């Protein structure tokens, strides 16, 4: 009921890194404090590392196990965007803002970081556990994918959106907004594929899959809180970032056809500013 519509929306959102000139960001970058520059670098590396997993494994593995030519085509298109567009865009932002040696060090740090690794490996673990012709294992991986696309990225997206909403780092913020817009539709689409599997299950199996999804969400959420404090306490933003994580967790659940887990909260306004014909056959006029 939905693949051709998503095909259309995906292909009409096509874009390339070269379209946004990045050099003018140096005019606001130079005015940020060390903690702001440090947080931005770390967040950016976090997003880059997670998105690479999605391009190399997440999207291609789902495309492999999903049946249907049109679904495979949409999924291929999404994998292409991760590898050919998003990955180049993140690299471009980095090369503009930091010298080569600084980029290498930030990636070394974020690669060793406990909270980034915990979530990255949890997601990758579920992708590696998909078994041929087993729709339960596929569903679990789709849940992981939706959580990455619609939830885990957002502790990171917060900061570029926060600057973007203030008139700072506008070129890279525009790029991030385009990336985020792609991840949103990726999350919704994979969510619909997961609901299709979920709806084929018994009531007991459904309850079991719901418990899986909520348990996974809880593990990721508790690690996100730690990840958030680790990055954002030094710039005083953690309270507001936490509200943004919960709001996006609720969107991820709704993508999977589940009820929201967290109470509704308002979001930081600066970040918001960044964001059957049957023919009449006669004898029907006579009664």
């Amino acid at each position: 009921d939905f693949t051709q519509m998503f095909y259309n929306q995906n292909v009409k959102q096509f874009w390339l890194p070269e379209e946004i000139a990045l050099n003018g960001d140096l005019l606001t970058w130079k005015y940020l404090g060390k903690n702001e520059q440090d947080t931005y670098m770390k967040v950016l590396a976090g997003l880059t590392l997670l998105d690479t997993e999605q391009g190399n494994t997440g999207m291609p593995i789902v495309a492999e196990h999903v049946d249907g030519h049109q679904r495979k085509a949409v999924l291929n298109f999404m994998a292409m965007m991760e590898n050919a567009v998003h990955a180049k865009s993140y690299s471009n932002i980095f090369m503009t803002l930091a010298p080569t040696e600084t980029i290498n060090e930030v990636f070394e740090w974020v690669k060793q970081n406990k909270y980034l690794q915990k979530k990255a490996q949890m997601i990758v673990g579920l992708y590696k556990a998909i078994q041929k012709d087993d729709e339960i294992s596929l569903f679990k991986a789709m849940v992981a994918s939706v959580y990455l696309e619609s939830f885990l990225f957002y502790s990171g997206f917060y900061y570029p959106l926060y600057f973007y909403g203030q008139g700072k780092l506008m070129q890279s913020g525009e790029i991030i907004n385009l990336i985020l817009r792609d991840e949103a539709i990726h999350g919704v689409y994979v969510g619909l594929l997961a609901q299709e599997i979920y709806n084929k299950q018994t009531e007991e199996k459904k309850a079991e899959l719901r418990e899986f999804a909520i348990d996974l969400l809880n593990q990721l959420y508790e690690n996100e809180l730690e990840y958030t404090e680790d990055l954002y306490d030094q710039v005083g933003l953690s309270h507001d970032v936490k509200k943004f994580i919960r709001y996006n967790a609720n969107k991820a659940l709704m993508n999977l056809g589940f009820d929201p887990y967290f109470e509704e909260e308002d979001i930081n306004p600066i970040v918001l500013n960044g964001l059957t014909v049957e023919p009449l056959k006669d004898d029907d006029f006579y009664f």
């Binding site: 109470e263 059957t276 014909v277 049957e278 009449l280 029907d284 006029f285 009664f287």
Partner: protein
């Protein structure tokens, strides 16, 4: 979760295989004790309450000044003498969330149910203490429910108007279109729904002063009115709802219908404009015979004949239009257009199907004007005259634009009290007062028609609830017999009260002498046919009540001939979807959509069992979707013969039925005398 909501949530928790319907009374008790009494500000005496409400711009001081304080005090006492208890949690919740007066911060409750009723009664009586107590007894017994604007805004200062709906005739000029937009925004500011007749607007591609193919048709006017209603949307309390009505023989009928298509582009798509289609009997005749039909350009007809297309009789003038080379037209397939109508109603519920000849065959005021369109709820069928708004500093030719003052009888409470006559007469008096006290300075035609026509709308509700609580199936012939008898009595007493008001005031509505009331044509079927119940079970319901016989109808006809009629229109059955909860009544004369309505208000679901739903009458409360729509058409046509205006007839369809089934229901409604069809709800 609140305690009252949790207790209301226990309705569907079935013990012993039955619904816990007794939990709703517990739910309402918890609601009151834990929220309403705690959040109701109390005064040491009624004098302090009235002084505080008048001084703080909550009440008008004018309407309370005609009574001495002892009279108001005794009116309130006789309002609380009833000791009214809400029967369901949803009734109290809806009242104290939508109608009960709250402080400026919306934190405390200033009005009880018995205070809203007392204030509305004091407004209605206008200086009469005994009449105020009569109104209090009428409303606290819940025999009569004033319309939502009237109930909510009577006696209040922060109020709009007491009129629930307005019908505007749009003439074919830029001055008239701009004034129609202005009046639509003014009346939407007042809170009432606005319906506009676009059949006089000339078609797309017509000539503007020798400049040919310059018009945008009626669709540009729909876009203008849609943005006007979006702009004047009552600040966001409730989105500005407007209605556009077009004759099916207008050339723009396909463009008019395409506005509700999902595939329609945003440059032609309207969003806040409900659309209605006026279908003369000629269109049904053409579709039945499968002949190719012609939709006409209104301005060509105006130039050739001097009258607007909707002002002439389609059944007589269709062949003359078709044979006229000077009348431009385009060929359409009437059966294909009917199928398009059916598919549009299936996909969106629009348009409102109005059978013009079904309205005008029994219309009493055809001399004033034919009924060319209905209201936003497709139940106000009144004569209207278009206003010729001229240039600035030039006097405008003000016509008649319909203003409808609505009021609903609770059939269950009216019948249980055996008070059809008194309830109908008191409701007629209250509606007359509402019409009189209502003036609208920014709509000259609405004001003129309110002063001259004095038309009121006295609807009815809880028909299905009364039938199911009496063991009568809504589709059964006994139900139709009861509807026939009850609404014949309602019409009899409404006419009697109108004639009594005309006698007391010495004045009738304008152009009454040309109406069928004056000539006696209205009473022919009443002095010829006896409408007493044919079933002994139904006749037992009217025990202790004097059913108007043929002789009584002859006496009423003579009385009307001698003294006249104060109201041009008296009866019109509105959907009443909001006030039905407060009165613990089913909405309108429509069958119930669901036995237990599921509603989400916040993060908690609030179930509303139907009024009086229980185990013994479960299968009497048969859902409207499971019912035969032909039987519902039969019921509404039985009711419609006693209603001078229309009835908000909603079609409840299943997803299994096709567009041909919808067309069959539409044609059966047309054949059975149904005047208007409101909605096509699909399950």
């Amino acid at each position: 979760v609140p305690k009252w909501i949790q207790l209301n949530n226990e309705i569907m928790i079935q013990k012993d295989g039955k619904f816990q319907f007794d939990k709703d009374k517990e739910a309402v008790h918890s609601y009151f004790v834990d929220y309403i009494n705690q959040n109701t500000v109390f005064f040491h005496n009624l004098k302090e309450k009235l002084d505080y409400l008048v001084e703080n711009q909550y009440y008008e001081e004018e309407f309370l000044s005609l009574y001495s304080f002892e009279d108001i005090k005794e009116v309130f006492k006789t309002a609380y003498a009833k000791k009214f208890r809400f029967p369901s949690f949803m009734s109290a919740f809806k009242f104290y969330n939508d109608y009960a007066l709250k402080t400026n911060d919306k934190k405390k409750i200033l009005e009880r149910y018995e205070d809203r009723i007392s204030i509305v009664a004091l407004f209605f009586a206008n200086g009469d203490t005994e009449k105020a107590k009569e109104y209090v007894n009428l409303m606290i017994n819940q025999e009569y429910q004033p319309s939502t604007p009237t109930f909510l805004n009577a006696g209040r200062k922060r109020r709009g108007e007491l009129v629930s709906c307005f019908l505007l005739e749009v003439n074919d000029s830029l001055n008239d279109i701009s004034r129609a937009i202005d009046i639509s925004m003014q009346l939407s500011k007042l809170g009432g729904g606005v319906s506009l007749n676009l059949s006089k607007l000339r078609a797309k591609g017509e000539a503007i002063k020798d400049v040919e193919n310059a018009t945008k048709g009626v669709v540009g006017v729909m876009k203008l009115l849609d943005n006007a209603f979006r702009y004047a949307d009552q600040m966001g309390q409730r989105q500005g709802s407007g209605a556009a009505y077009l004759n099916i023989f207008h050339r723009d009928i396909n463009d008019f219908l395409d506005t509700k298509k999902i595939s329609a582009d945003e440059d032609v798509r309207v969003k806040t404009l409900s659309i209605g289609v006026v279908i003369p009997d000629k269109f049904v005749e053409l579709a039945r015979e499968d002949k190719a039909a012609y939709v006409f350009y209104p301005h060509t007809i105006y130039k050739e004949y001097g009258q607007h297309m909707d002002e002439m009789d389609m059944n007589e003038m269709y062949d003359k239009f078709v044979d006229n080379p000077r009348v431009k037209k385009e060929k359409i397939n009437p059966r294909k257009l009917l199928e398009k109508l059916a598919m549009l109603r299936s996909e969106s519920g629009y348009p409102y199907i109005m059978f013009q000849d079904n309205v005008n065959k029994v219309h009493a005021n055809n001399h004033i004007s034919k009924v060319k369109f209905s209201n936003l709820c497709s139940e106000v069928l009144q004569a209207s005259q278009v206003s010729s708004y001229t240039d600035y500093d030039e006097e405008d030719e003000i016509g008649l634009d319909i203003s409808c003052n609505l009021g609903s009888l609770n059939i269950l409470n009216v019948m249980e009290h055996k008070s059809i006559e008194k309830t109908v007469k008191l409701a007629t008096d209250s509606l007359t007062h509402v019409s009189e006290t209502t003036d609208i300075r920014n709509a000259p035609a609405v004001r003129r028609a309110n002063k001259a026509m004095k038309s009121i709308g006295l609807g009815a509700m809880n028909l299905h609830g009364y039938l199911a609580q009496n063991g009568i199936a809504y589709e059964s012939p006994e139900a139709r017999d009861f509807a026939n008898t009850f609404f014949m009595m309602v019409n009899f007493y409404s006419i009697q009260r109108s004639a009594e008001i005309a006698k007391e005031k010495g004045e009738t509505f304008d152009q009454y002498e040309g109406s069928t009331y004056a000539t006696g044509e209205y009473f022919d079927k009443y002095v010829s046919t006896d409408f007493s119940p044919k079933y002994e079970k139904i006749a037992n319901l009217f025990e202790g009540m004097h059913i108007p016989t043929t002789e009584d109808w002859k006496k009423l006809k003579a009385f009307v001939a001698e003294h006249g009629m104060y109201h041009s229109y008296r009866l019109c059955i509105a959907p009443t979807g909001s006030i039905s909860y407060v009165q613990s009544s089913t909405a309108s004369v429509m069958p119930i959509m669901e036995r237990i309505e599921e509603r989400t208000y916040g993060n908690s679901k609030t179930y509303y069992p139907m009024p009086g739903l229980a185990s013994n009458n479960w299968f009497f409360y048969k859902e409207a979707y499971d019912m035969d729509m032909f039987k519902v058409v039969d019921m509404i046509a039985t009711i419609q013969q006693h209603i001078d205006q229309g009835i908000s007839f909603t079609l409840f369809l299943k997803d299994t039925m096709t567009t041909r089934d919808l067309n069959r229901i539409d044609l059966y409604a047309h054949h059975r005398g149904i005047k208007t069809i409101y909605y096509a709800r699909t399950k």
